């Protein structure tokens, strides 16, 4: 069952690294096996103190277990942060590494599980709540308050694993966080209203 | 090649635009459709993703060329010089009438 | 209700030194309204936690939003790559 599961991931990782060549980058052994929240602090300690991903599968470094893809999620997250700290925030290779990591992390999260409030005291008393929880990433935008115009900006395409301080081209610029809206969809009008007889 | 100046910015569409179905005389950019700077009057459903590059050999009549002619007939109802360029300009006035009939 | 408003403003002082990640003119475009973040453009109208059937307080944290995004399996992608060449 897991034999083809070792091959179908390898085929996607080979096909999705043509324009950027993430797999063909130089990568050392890097035996950390640590918390992936602390995956960059141990790398900075390795820099202060002192075999590529295409060759790991050729050498048989991954086994058909949970650790055999925990190490893959560790190694891809090691490669992507090295490429983020190598390329600047304006190059197209940065966006290619960001899109490749956002695809690879979703591909590694999938196919693994298959194998104080005054409203609350009324709503919990009157209804029954079935819950569903998930996590989303957010971004940052700029903010300029001129003479009664209230200027806004666009979505910064900076990756979530950049770990750089927030530089400002001007002191008077402000920063803000955009909360994403996600719920059940609104009932859109039909095709009689969309494309009506004018 | 027509210059499709996008809404709400001074940018130019490279190869893709978003044709509107209720204003019918504007387009959008790819980043402008991602970030939603099209105004609060619309609900982001009446925006058809169309192309801007050159098509294949003539008398093929793909879905974009079939949609834009029926859009322009509902706009003007005459003046086929103003109908042939709504497809993209690469179709003849004498040929769009033969296709519509 | 007006349609032909500007909704685009560019400051005359060019501070285009460290600005390459934003949306440039080719200057910085400054809108009158902010941006919106949409997670997934496709909605799975099944997955009965959303459709709420009338048969039978329960909490359940699902892994990732990709259940509601119609994500295919990797075996079909590998089969299509085998059909590519």
């Amino acid at each position: 069952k897991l034999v083809d599961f070792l091959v179908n991931v390898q085929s996607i990782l080979n096909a999705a690294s043509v324009k950027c060549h993430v797999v063909d980058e130089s990568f050392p052994a890097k035996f950390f096996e640590k918390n992936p929240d602390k995956i960059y602090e141990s790398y900075c300690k390795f820099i202060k103190n002192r075999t590529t991903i295409n060759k790991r599968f050729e050498n048989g470094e991954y086994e058909p277990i949970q650790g055999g893809f925990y190490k893959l999620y560790h190694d891809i997250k090691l490669v992507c942060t090295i490429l983020i700290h190598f390329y600047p925030q304006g190059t197209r290779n940065y966006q290619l590494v960001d899109k490749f990591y956002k695809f690879s992390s979703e591909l590694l999260l999938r196919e693994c599980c298959r194998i104080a409030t005054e409203l609350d005291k009324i709503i919990s008393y009157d209804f029954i709540k079935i819950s569903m929880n998930y996590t989303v990433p957010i971004s940052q935008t700029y903010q300029i308050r001129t003479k009664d115009m209230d200027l806004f900006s666009s979505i910064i395409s900076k990756s979530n694993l950049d770990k750089r301080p927030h530089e400002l081209p001007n002191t008077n610029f402000k920063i803000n966080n955009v909360l994403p809206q996600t719920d059940i969809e609104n009932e859109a009008p039909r095709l009689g209203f969309v494309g009506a007889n004018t | 090649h027509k210059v499709y100046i996008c809404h709400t910015c001074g940018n130019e569409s490279i190869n893709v635009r978003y044709h509107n179905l209720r204003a019918r005389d504007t387009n959008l950019c790819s980043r402008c459709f991602q970030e939603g700077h099209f105004g609060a009057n619309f609900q982001s459903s009446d925006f058809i993703r169309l192309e801007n590059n050159g098509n294949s050999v003539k008398k093929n009549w793909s879905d974009q060329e079939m949609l834009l002619l029926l859009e322009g007939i509902e706009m003007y109802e005459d003046q086929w010089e103003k109908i042939a360029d709504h497809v993209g300009g690469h179709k003849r006035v004498e040929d769009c009438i033969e296709k519509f009939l | 209700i007006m349609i032909d408003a500007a909704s685009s403003f560019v400051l005359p002082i060019s501070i285009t030194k460290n600005v390459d990640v934003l949306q440039r003119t080719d200057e910085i475009l400054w809108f009158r309204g902010p941006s919106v973040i949409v997670n997934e453009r496709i909605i799975n109208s099944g997955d009965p936690h959303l459709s709420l059937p009338l048969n039978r307080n329960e909490k359940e944290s699902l892994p990732g939003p990709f259940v509601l995004g119609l994500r295919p399996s990797a075996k079909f992608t590998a089969h299509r790559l085998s059909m590519l060449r």
Binding site: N172 | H1 | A6
Partner: peptide, 29 residues
């Protein structure tokens, strides 16, 4: 900084819909 109003960029819908991109056609000498 609050006295720094900007220049509006108009839509120009007639220049947005179907503008193209005459001595190149030899009919006017």
């Amino acid at each position: 900084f609050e006295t720094m109003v900007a220049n509006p960029i108009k839509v120009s819908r007639l220049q947005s819909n179907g503008v193209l991109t005459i001595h190149y056609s030899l009919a006017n000498f």
